[model samples]
Target: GRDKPLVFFNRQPSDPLTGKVDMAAMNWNDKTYYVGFDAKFGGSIQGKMILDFLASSESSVDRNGDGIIGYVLCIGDVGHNDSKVRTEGIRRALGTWTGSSDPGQAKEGQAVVGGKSYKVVELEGKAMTGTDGSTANTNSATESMGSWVAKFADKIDLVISNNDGMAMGCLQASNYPRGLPIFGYDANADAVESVGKGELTGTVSQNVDAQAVAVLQIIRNLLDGSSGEDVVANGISRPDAHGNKISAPVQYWEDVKAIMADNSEVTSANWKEYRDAGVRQVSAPTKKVLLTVHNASNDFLASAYLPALKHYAPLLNVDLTVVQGDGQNELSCLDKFTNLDMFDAFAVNMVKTNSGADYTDKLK
Candidate 1:
């Protein structure tokens, strides 16, 4: 009875086709549960939104009415499933998805959508993101957008990014513009604020508050000695249609393989409602917990999940102690998972999706 509960927040590196366990640091087991948002599905959602937006704002977005909608795309973490599928989602919706096995990109050709021929002139991608989402990638996105600016000038019609961080980076690069019709995922605070002011065009709301609160709730349950299924069925909110409570925010496959948070398109109309989404209201006996997250200071974590985790932590009676990871390599965050005899519970966001063995092999 000496073992402690564990939750993997965000990334996973399983063999996509076979569903085989690939990571030694985090995997599905009795004591471990994988919690994060659905990458492929979220990508599909993002893709349709971009397609719909383009269709709806055709006259304004495609100025001069030449019928050729020229745009640039900024990607996050080339070949990684999260970035790949998001790219796939958008491309597929626009009739440009070549193949999933191929690294995510809009196939070079005219993407005919709603009687308008769309051309993705440039796509900048090469390790654009790290574990905590997109700090390094943001810089890369901006640089790429800068070049696009120098080349295309005002000829460029739209800027689509994998996440809000890179979207903001593209916006920052275009220091000269006119409501450029930039769209991003992650509905980050800054991006949302921009949407409110008609700066950025749209973003997807990834149910940050609900997902963060669920993590805290999981820890609270374990602290009170709740089992795996009970940790889920006990009291998480807004499950998918199937009824798995841990899958509360978005989609989660059977047996809790990948518990996901909810996501939806966000624009000027709904920015105010999501401005302060987060959590509260749980009173538990004081429990000291240790949280190890990769790249804790990155854009998405810093603005969204981090605050929610910290704010709801105390309310759940979790005396949380945080440790930051280098956001690189297989063993970065798992290295600090010591002093195990002292802490009551653990929350880990691995440096890489497949770094599970280092955690499992260590003693309880």
Candidate 2:
């Protein structure tokens, strides 16, 4: 049995302009760890620096076989510049594992391992129009990428991707071939669930309020000369050739415990705390204003925020009402919004919250 692990990766920031790591909010000790995208790939350069820090410290452990005993994969914003950044991150991760100790300067999609050159499988993505007029997966690029991955099934120990959509497409194409573990950036809902189910190995969690804090704690362990368990209580494990009786580094246990606790807390009261604390406060006008929910039905609340609206209604001196859009008359609701006298301001829940037939209109 294995315990969940606490892991963190740099993700989007609340403030767009600030690129510096939110060090104050993060956990840290005398030990300094790297954070940012790789300089080679040239974005935030946090991932590469973190790897270098791990290598210098004893906290990192190499579990599967690429060479370096332990390291974290960094690949958010992958495939930017036509897979250039994604490819560079992969090259750097490989170099660190194989003990090459050189910055990735090789031509695109190739790296030398154990004095022999290994060519990376490249997947060129093509943009396509989906059935719904939204962008969907391009078959040619997807198939090519999948085939390349399947061909090297035996050699790949890990995969680093920036986009969840691309990762999911590749996984579908690979047909769930076993062996190399895959990790990705971005907290795509499906991708995270996949990690939980072991479809993919793990992810560099970017949910800052939680994941980022955990990352800071991991860094503290590295600096304080404490085994990972000293800071993290949970255990960590990896599958062997037979997918059994594997050896995991000591720190891995701590990592696992931290993750499990964090997960449990997230699904509990912590979620509401985070949500309430995170929402930006909006000041409503002092004059009486009308707040309305549009195109609602039997359970208008299922797609409306009457409770939340009520709270603000008092603040804004407004009356809130739920308007049911009979059949597919969402256009009526829109017209009401556009009319100056119909509503002071209006709100509507999107597809994720409402799945009824009446909520089908798109504002194109």
Candidate 3:
């Protein structure tokens, strides 16, 4: 590999053999780094938000008068870490944890929370494409919601999905009951709109701008031979005027209030908050950045993530060209990177974390 100094945004490139994140093995030199938010933290918030909603709207959202909560869970991908942590968070919150971090185990069971009873009743997992790949997608979820509706009938109190697409699916499927409180992750435009319209209960928003800003800032910081943290006044983190802090191993915008505010962007009926933060730029020289996205058409990427990239790229003085994949393999995405001389750095959002070599292999 050319040791082109790279950063992974939103997804870590894993060593296929050991199934661990091996930065050294990922490339020739030490510049390979990962800059993504913590899925566990996001998952915890997601679980709590949904649980609190259940508690607050109990009398109404609990369609059945049985004094019990029955819900259907649609997992995006069973094997993905994000999905696992999300399921774990929900289980831990619901008091259904089985003493391990497995996402594929039985999600249907009876549990007690706050002296109230709950039933998962139905749980299912599906990757978006290619033999157990892609989570948080729509097609499989829509069909899954139908099956749950047909078999479970009107007993479903609420619908829970790992990400926005699946949540949107549950709302779109035929025979879908009206006004069922549905929850999703990654507050994309449509899902956020759904939330404002009272169709979706809520979603988790990672603040695409923060992620893009963090990745670029980190890239600039490292390019200047500084540590992940900046010596010039705690660069990666500093208090905002409102006295809140952003955090991360890579970089995480973990302020729940901020997360809620971001996810609830449609709470203002427009992309108001994000639309205004369009001018925060870093002072760095131009760097030719190749951003390889796993799926250009992923609802999150198309609406939130891509817009964040284009905005931050120019402001950060980044000479950027983007490429995309078909949601099947890494090669299909990374394969699009040609005539490497035009690019000086890489920002990869991988489709499948296991297929990291498909991109790393090409860097040489």
Candidate 4:
């Protein structure tokens, strides 16, 4: 079971200034490549929005100057809120400016790709701040964020987003009480069903195959003499609400769908609710496989590991014990590691595992 084929690629660039560097391109061979959905792996709401938006133009009328019409809302992970993944998702949806964050900012708001024009908006840094005590939880932060997003309403036609939390933020900001035509990436069940009922446009889908397909398409284009810069530099046309259109490059749903279809299976029923309920079903350990892990207190590590491990419990008959140690406190950390003896396997921190290769070899 540990023999699964794992291929590592460059992480998505978070900084907007970073040139178009296909992290997935490094792994593209003549045959297959991987698409990184960043933090979003699978859930239906996100992907379904993308599909419905593409299928129905009326759902996403190009009111803005952008060539296309659709707004996407992406909410990054709670802890990391990765900008790199957000940027990549935006470019994939727009099909323009693989390198620059201001694709819509250039030359009257336009970019060209594959000799076609499209409209897009890069609403980077438009996220809700953590509920830190430093700032009040009033609607002001959201209002200000919305003000920034609304400024581009005239030039932007579509929004290709990752998370719904951010989309909700946009919804709060927009004057369109009915809400902007929105699309999502991760299949959050509520998002999918809502979009299906015409509450939103559609979603791109978050099936494993869909993720892989998105990544592979980038790789395929790169190998075929495409550069991320080329995607950004080309001029495209965008349509506006006034019945007038401007030039802006846009992303093609075909590209997203092609890769998505490759490794995806349509879910007929609402599966997200069941999956979420399963995570809440944690019970006290009794004849369960106890797993001892280091650096267990890391919030992100815990969030990711718990969900996957909980899902694996039935098959492996395991109960996970996440033992956390203070970072930079060697004695305390070592003490916790030694205490892991009670568990069958020691799940070491990835960083420590990488450094202590020989030590890990000894474990075998």
**Deviating ranges (above 4 Å) for candidate 4:** 1-60, 64-86, 98-118, 121-145, 149-156, 172-179, 204-308, 322-338, 346-364
lDDT of each: 0.67, 0.33, 0.63, 0.35
Q: Evaluate model 3: give its lDDT.
A: 0.63
**lDDT head-to-head 2 vs 3, winner:** 3
For model 3, how does the per-residue alpha-carbon lDDT over 1-364 read when each residue is reduced to its tens digit?
3656677766655543333554444443556656556677777887788677765554655566665567777766554565567767776766556754543554445544454766654343334342345556677777778887898776787787778888898888888998887778887878877877788878877666566756665555555566433411133465322232334223333221011112221222343332424335555577787888888767877788888778767766777788998766667886787767678777777877766566666777
User: What's the lDDT for candidate 4?
Assistant: 0.35
Provide the global lDDT of candidate 1 against the true structure. 0.67
lDDT of 4 by residue, 71-138 (tens): 33343332222333443434553443354333232112233323455444444433333444211122
lDDT of 1 by residue, 1-364 (tens): 1367777776655543434545444443555666677766788898777777776664666654555666777766553456567767777766666774243444554554466666644343334543445434777777777887777766677877778888888877755366778888888888889999998988887777667766767767676777746666454654322232433344445444555776788877788876123234455589877787787656887788888788777766788888877655546676677887788777777665555656666644
- Top model number, TM-score: 1
Ten-residue stretch with the least lDDT total in model 4:
1-10
Query: What TM-score does structure 2 among the candidates reach?
Result: 0.34
lDDT of 2 by residue, 1-364 (tens): 0011112222211121222333322222222222222223321232343233233433112223444332122222221231234444454544432322122333233333344444343222223223433222324325534665556444443444444454555567645455345544333456556765666544332232332223333332332334533444211122212222112121222211223112111111122222112222223233222222332431222212244345433332344444433323335444443332343322332211122122212211
Query: Who wins the lDDT comparison?
Result: 1
Task: Note each model's CA RMSD in angstroms.
Answer: 4.4, 18.3, 5.3, 15.4
For model 2, the local distance difference test gives 0.33
